[PDB]
Amino acid sequence: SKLKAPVFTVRTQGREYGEFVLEPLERGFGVTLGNPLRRILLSSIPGTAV
Amino acid sequence: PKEVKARDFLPVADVEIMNPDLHIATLEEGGRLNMEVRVDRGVGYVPAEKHGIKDRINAIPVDAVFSPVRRVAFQVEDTRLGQRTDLDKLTLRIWTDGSVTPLEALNQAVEILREHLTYFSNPQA
Amino acid sequence: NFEDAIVISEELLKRDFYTSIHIERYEIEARDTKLGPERITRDIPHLSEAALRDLDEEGVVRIGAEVKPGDILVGRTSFKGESEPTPEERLLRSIFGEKARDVKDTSLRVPPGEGGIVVRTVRLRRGDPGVELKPGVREVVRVYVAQKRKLQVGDKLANRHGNKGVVAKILPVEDMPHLPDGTPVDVILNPLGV
Amino acid sequence: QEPVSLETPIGDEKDSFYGDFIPDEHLPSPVDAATQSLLSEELEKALSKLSEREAMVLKLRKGLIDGEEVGAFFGVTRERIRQIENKALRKLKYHE
Amino acid sequence: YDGRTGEPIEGPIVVGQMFIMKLYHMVEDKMHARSTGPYSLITQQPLG
Amino acid sequence: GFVEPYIRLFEAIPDAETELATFYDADLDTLPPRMFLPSGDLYTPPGPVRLEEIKRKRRVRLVKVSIYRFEHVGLGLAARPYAYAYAWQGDNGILHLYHAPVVLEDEVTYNESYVRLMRAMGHVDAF
Amino acid sequence: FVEPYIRLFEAIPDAETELATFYDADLDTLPPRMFLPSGDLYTPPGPVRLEEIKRKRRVRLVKVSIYRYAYAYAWQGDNGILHLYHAPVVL
Amino acid sequence: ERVVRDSLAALYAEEDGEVAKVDGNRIVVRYEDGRLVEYPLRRFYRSNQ
Numbered sequence A: 001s002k003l004k005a006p007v008f009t010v011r012t013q014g015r016e017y018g019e020f021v022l023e024p025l026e027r028g029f030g031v032t033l034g035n036p037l038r039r040i041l042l043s044s045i046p047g048t049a050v
Numbered sequence B: 001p002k003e004v005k006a007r008d009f010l011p012v013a014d015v016e017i018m019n020p021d022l023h024i025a026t027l028e029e030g031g032r033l034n035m036e037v038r039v040d041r042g043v044g045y046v047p048a049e050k051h052g053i054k055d056r057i058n059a060i061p062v063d064a065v066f067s068p069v070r071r072v073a074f075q076v077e078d079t080r081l082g083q084r085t086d087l088d089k090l091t092l093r094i095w096t097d098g099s100v101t102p103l104e105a106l107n108q109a110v111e112i113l114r115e116h117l118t119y120f121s122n123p124q125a
Numbered sequence C: 001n002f003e004d005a006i007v008i009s010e011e012l013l014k015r016d017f018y019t020s021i022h023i024e025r026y027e028i029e030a031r032d033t034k035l036g037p038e039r040i041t042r043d044i045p046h047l048s049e050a051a052l053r054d055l056d057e058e059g060v061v062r063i064g065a066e067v068k069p070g071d072i073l074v075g076r077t078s079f080k081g082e083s084e085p086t087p088e089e090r091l092l093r094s095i096f097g098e099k100a101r102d103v104k105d106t107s108l109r110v111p112p113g114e115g116g117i118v119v120r121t122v123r124l125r126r127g128d129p130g131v132e133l134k135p136g137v138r139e140v141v142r143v144y145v146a147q148k149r150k151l152q153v154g155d156k157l158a159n160r161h162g163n164k165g166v167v168a169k170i171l172p173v174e175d176m177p178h179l180p181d182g183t184p185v186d187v188i189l190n191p192l193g194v
Numbered sequence D: 001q002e003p004v005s006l007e008t009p010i011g012d013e014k015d016s017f018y019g020d021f022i023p024d025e026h027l028p029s030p031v032d033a034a035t036q037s038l039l040s041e042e043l044e045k046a047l048s049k050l051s052e053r054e055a056m057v058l059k060l061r062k063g064l065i066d067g068e069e070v071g072a073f074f075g076v077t078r079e080r081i082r083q084i085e086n087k088a089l090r091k092l093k094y095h096e
Numbered sequence E: 001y002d003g004r005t006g007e008p009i010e011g012p013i014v015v016g017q018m019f020i021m022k023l024y025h026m027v028e029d030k031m032h033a034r035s036t037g038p039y040s041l042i043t044q045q046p047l048g
Numbered sequence F: 001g002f003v004e005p006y007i008r009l010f011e012a013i014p015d016a017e018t019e020l021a022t023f024y025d026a027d028l029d030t031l032p033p034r035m036f037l038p039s040g041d042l043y044t045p046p047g048p049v050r051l052e053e054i055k056r057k058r059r060v061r062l063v064k065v066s067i068y069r070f071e072h073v074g075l076g077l078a079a080r081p082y083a084y085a086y087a088w089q090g091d092n093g094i095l096h097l098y099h100a101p102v103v104l105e106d107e108v109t110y111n112e113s114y115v116r117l118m119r120a121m122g123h124v125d126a127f
Numbered sequence G: 001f002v003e004p005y006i007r008l009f010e011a012i013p014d015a016e017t018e019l020a021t022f023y024d025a026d027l028d029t030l031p032p033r034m035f036l037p038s039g040d041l042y043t044p045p046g047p048v049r050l051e052e053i054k055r056k057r058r059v060r061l062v063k064v065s066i067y068r069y070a071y072a073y074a075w076q077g078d079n080g081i082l083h084l085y086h087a088p089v090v091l
Numbered sequence H: 001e002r003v004v005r006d007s008l009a010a011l012y013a014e015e016d017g018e019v020a021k022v023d024g025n026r027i028v029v030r031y032e033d034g035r036l037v038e039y040p041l042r043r044f045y046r047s048n049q
Helices: A029-043 B102-117 C086-095 D033-049 D052-063 D078-093 F003-011 F112-121 G003-010 H002-006
Strands: A007-013 A017-023 B002-005 B023-027 B069-073 B076-078 B088-090 B093-096 C006-009 C020-031 C072-074 C076-079 C103-105 C117-124 C137-149 C156-159 C165-171 E020-022 F049-056 F061-072 F077-089 F095-097 G048-055 G060-066 G070-076 G082-084 H017-022 H026-031 H036-040
Touching: A029 B102, B093 B102, C020 C072, C072 C137, C086 D033, C086 D052, C086 D078, C086 F112, D033 D052, D033 F112, D052 D078, D078 F112, F003 F049, F003 F061, F003 F077, F061 F095, G003 G048, G003 G060, G060 G082
Parallel strands: C006 C165
Antiparallel strands: A007 A017, B002 B023, B069 B093, B076 B088, C020 C137, C076 C103, C117 C137, C156 C165, C156 E020, F049 F061, F061 F077, F077 F095, G048 G060, G060 G070, G070 G082, H017 H026, H026 H036
16 A cells, blocks of 8 residues: 555646646545645635736 | 353453443353353454354354444534634544544544555655 | 336445345265265365365365355265275285375365355264265265345346246436436336226 | 267357357377387286286286176186185286 | 535435345355366256 | 375365264285376376375374385396385375375385276376 | 474374464574473573474474583474474584 | 234234243243143244255
8 A cells, every 4th residue: 555655657748738646545635635735726826916 | 140241251361341231141040151252453444255254163263243333423624713614623533443543543544644644655657 | 117027226235225145055865885984174186275174174175264166065975986996906905005096186176156144054973963864875064055135137036916027127216217306216116007 | 978069159048159168279199109118018028928827818808898706717616716816916017 | 415515406305214125146156156166977068 | 204294185175074984904915096186187107106194084084105216136026115205095095195105215926917996997107 | 304304294294274484493593392202391501503404383493402402303392392303412 | 914914923922821932942831720831942043045
């Protein structure tokens, strides 16, 4: 379980788009991370606009 | 003639039966009951099928439900605090069998989560 | 929960709910032959000690042993077929340790499919004490084998109102629909079935 | 009981023929020709190596027609057939 | 509430206690898979 | 002292309510019964065997099996103690070995044809 | 002088349970109970070191080296108790 | 209720009374009329299907 220490791998092209893959993860943890990580990404990230 | 409860187990040093009034089983006269149960520490749900545990060859492995969490409810209520109204006041509620306490478990959980965020450490290929 | 499929909370298994016992029942005969009588015993020839551990001294699997498809339930030994060759062999019987012939193993194996644990054996032996054994039949043996059958995926469930469905997914308690108070539902039926 | 015909309804008398139900085991069916080849020759070797009266007695009494000791002897005592039979076997098995 | 998001389900949903049963059709009597094996003697199509 | 774990293994055979079996006390005089290794492999002896019974149940028993090799001396052969092994014996006389046999470190004759016959029916190792 | 004890060891009841942990005794630690094939207690002139040869789930075979000096083959259970297959051979 | 009743699934007392003994194996009762009855139980039996 521990040695199964996941592999954070990435495909990043330019500054506009990125694919981030992380496996393997225990039963139903993908959602446990992905869902609240997205909730952060979409609201509480710091920026500027008109 | 007895109603065997869980308290009727022999005491063991660093163990606490949480469940003393648990109705193990019901003896009448000249009823004889004698057994050795094996408790283990472990994680999640593990049938007897999977783990197949026997100390002796008249044992019967039993299904393990380890998680000492009975139910978990978050609650998300508007708190107008000071300036803005749309703030969340989160109070989550935890139910435990007593083996661990709610608090203990909540902290173990946060730790599991943080540690899981640590897996976004070094990228690759 | 597509076209009639049904989804389940793992919680039903932890609190042994949709779990049912089932008892199969295996049977074998010690028929009696032109080549000589078959016999129910422990010492089958070409078998590894490992395969024999669970058989009692008579060659019947012992109560409360876990039996896998391919295991022996009942050891039975028949003589070599193509009959008793009088002209040369008859003499050999005298010549050499009379009964030193040859005997192959024709036992009772748990079939592909399965069994579980042996719960009950029945022997119906010669000097037949109230029994109508067939002509040729020396005794018969039945071994009863049970299994606790939890609700695996692929099973069938249905309500009284005639909702045939298959169990198609077992969700962990954690990620399946729960009321405000942390109480989750146990099963998830498609409305499209109505 | 004779050999039964190969085509009979089995079980539920619907459409099964009793060739359906029986698998295959072995083609060579070995240990037949080679064994007989060694067998009858060695048998005959020791058969010949003792007095032909004794050998031949239950050679053909047990292996050229049928089963008899009452009728065994051409014409001697039941005692003598018994006797020389046994002793013949004995010397035949283990020569001193 | 969804289990996995914690967001609610955008529309209320009927729930309740339902009597439901486990039928004779479990998946033991049911799943086979042949590679190779025996074959009938007159007709050489397989059996087990 | 070697005897006792094999005792242990014997009595650990589960019982059954049955009548008693008459065992095949094999000897130099008779056919060595079929012998098998714990691996279910057939073991072919070099000659006949003698059996020393140590324990018995109703239908099976434990024996010390003395394995004899044949040796040429005057008009055929004589049986010489060659090796030994513990085994249990079922009612069909078949000897089931609790291990590979122990090779032993270093006025009766038998017929050539006798051993021929044993070669043929296969309870003898040629050479 | 070792193979006969491989045979005597492999004669022990293969009882499939979890793999036990055997106490790998050392000069650093106590010597454990040691018994001769008779069941008699043999007490050593110092501590002992072990070399594991074979292992089942609940028992293993070891060569026991005795310092003060000598050696002996034995089997060890999950009680660590050394059961010798013979009285120690003095070097 | 009437279905488990009319089928012979269950076991029902024959008279008013009291219970004497209760094994997993059988039950024993003491009735008004003086009787005391043993009812053994179908401990774990296999069914046609």
